[PDB]
């Protein structure tokens, strides 16, 4: 069984992602991945409290995290073509909120 706890989930997600995919590009991709991991941990650990939380026991899993990582990667690459530290405002926040 997976160990219960937010910290365990975030550690597992971080170990899942290769460092080459999390460190390349603008240096903000790392913090974007951290936000993705925290959001995944919140929506996957709330799942245990099925009545008070996700009304039905949804199936948010590894594939969803991989798809979200692919989305973040593609949209950050398209928004920031270079490798400079893209400003926070220029981050496609609306795209990530809408797609996810």
């Amino acid at each position: 069984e997976p160990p219960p706890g937010v910290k365990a989930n975030m550690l597992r997600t971080f170990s899942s992602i290769p460092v080459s995919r999390i460190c390349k590009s603008p240096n903000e991709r790392a913090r974007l991945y951290f936000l993705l991991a925290w959001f995944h941990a919140i929506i996957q650990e709330r799942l245990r409290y099925a009545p008070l939380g996700w009304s039905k026991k949804y199936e948010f899993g590894e594939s969803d995290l991989r798809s979200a990582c692919d989305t973040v990667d593609t949209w950050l690459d398209d928004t920031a073509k270079g490798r400079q530290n893209i400003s926070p405002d220029k981050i496609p926040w609306s795209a990530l909120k809408t797609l996810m």
Binding site: V6, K7, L11, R31, F34, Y49, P51, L52
Partner: protein
């Protein structure tokens, strides 16, 4: 505040042990409901053993 994987990882391992339900935004007493549900589940599981 970090610019690389390592800073965020060290922040993760530094998280306090006490994960209250207030972490998720749920009220802290949802743990009480979860424990009551699991207790009733244990009662039922024992009951079906006859």
């Amino acid at each position: 505040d970090g610019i690389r994987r390592e800073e965020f990882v060290q922040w993760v391992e530094l998280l306090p042990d006490t994960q209250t339900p207030s972490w998720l935004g749920l009220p802290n007493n949802a743990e009480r409901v979860l424990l009551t549900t699991q207790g009733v589940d244990m009662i039922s599981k024992m009951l079906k053993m006859q």
